[PDB]
Amino acid sequence: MSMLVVVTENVPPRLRGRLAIWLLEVRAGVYVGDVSAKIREMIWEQIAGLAEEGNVVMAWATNTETGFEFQTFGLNRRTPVDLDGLRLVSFLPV
């Protein structure tokens, strides 16, 4: 049971309702909750199955060095990058 945040963008309303089934949507396309690893894998299954055009980013609490991890689906100007193991986000130009 760790903390979860799912940020959606350009996502069709099916995935938005489906995410609202389990997670609290505190801002447009920003969902937050507290789920286990299995439930998180199921929610990511929903994300991969229902977005189809938009981009989604999912982050959850862990025991890594930064204390959390995140994962992306689809393309966004903000793209994750690897720095010798540590994952950050970089903003691509136009």
Partner: protein
């Protein structure tokens, strides 16, 4: 996508809804009030949803709540349970057939009754007593326990019918979560051993085993304070009691421990 349920220990205890129509929007369980305020509800992340008078649930909402394993419970006056809707085939055949097997055999039924008696009260049940005799003993001790807590919290008590309001609200919440757990594990709520006949007999047994631990005395406290809004304080205290005691996580091992007396 499948949209399968979440384990019961992972979700929130209970949510109360009032005076609004309940719709499904883009797949979500939404509550709309008379003014137009849409309010999404994490239907999949709550054990049971309580519907108060004034709610108007739609078909897709009942289907949706059913698919995510979230028991709907219509309650009326003082939160007393009126009706309920859940999964139509959400009974596990091995658990259901084991329970019914224990219920058919008179010997195993006596074993289960004695187990419930020995779990509700610290002392073992009196030996060589029939089912009805143990039922009467447990009933007399229930009356003496209600009167005992009544003297401890200093509220006038003429019998189990303000104090009946608080007791009915808290015990009604416990019956809600207990019914949700019973349906979730696959057992039947109508097949009871101590209580019989009523369609929620097993819920009355399992929940009555543990209601006097923390649920009833808190309702006596709220009954003595007697605030202007008793139901809300009772609900709050019920959620804190369910979270602290982790009742939802230890309801199923209580059922399996009771039915384990059948060897």
């Amino acid at each position: 996508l499948p949209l399968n349920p979440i384990p019961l220990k992972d979700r929130v205890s209970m949510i109360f809804l009032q005076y609004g129509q309940i719709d499904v929007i883009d797949g979500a369980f939404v509550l709309i009030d008379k003014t137009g305020i849409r309010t999404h509800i994490p239907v999949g992340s709550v054990a049971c949803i309580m519907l108060e008078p004034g709610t108007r649930v739609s078909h897709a909402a009942v289907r949706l709540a059913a698919q995510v394993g979230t028991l709907l419970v219509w309650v009326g006056e003082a939160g007393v349970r009126v009706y309920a809707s859940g999964q139509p085939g959400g009974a596990r055949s091995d658990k259901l057939l084991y329970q019914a097997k224990l219920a058919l055999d008179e010997d195993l039924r006596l074993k289960v009754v004695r187990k419930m008696f020995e779990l509700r009260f610290g002392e073992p049940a009196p030996a060589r007593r029939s089912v009805e005799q143990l039922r009467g003993i447990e009933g007399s001790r229930v009356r003496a326990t209600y009167a005992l807590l009544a003297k401890q919290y200093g509220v006038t008590w003429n019998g189990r019918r303000t104090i009946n309001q608080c007791i009915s609200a808290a015990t009604s919440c416990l019956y809600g979560v207990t019914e949700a757990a019973i349906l979730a594990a696959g057992y039947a709520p109508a097949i009871g051993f101590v209580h019989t006949g009523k369609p929620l007999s097993f819920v009355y047994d399992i929940a009555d085993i543990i209601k006097f631990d923390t649920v009833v005395p808190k309702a006596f406290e709220i009954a003595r304070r007697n605030p202007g809004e008793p139901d809300r304080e009772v609900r709050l205290a019920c959620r804190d009691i369910f979270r602290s005691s982790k009742t939802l996580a230890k309801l199923i091992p209580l059922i399996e421990d009771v039915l384990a007396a059948g060897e």
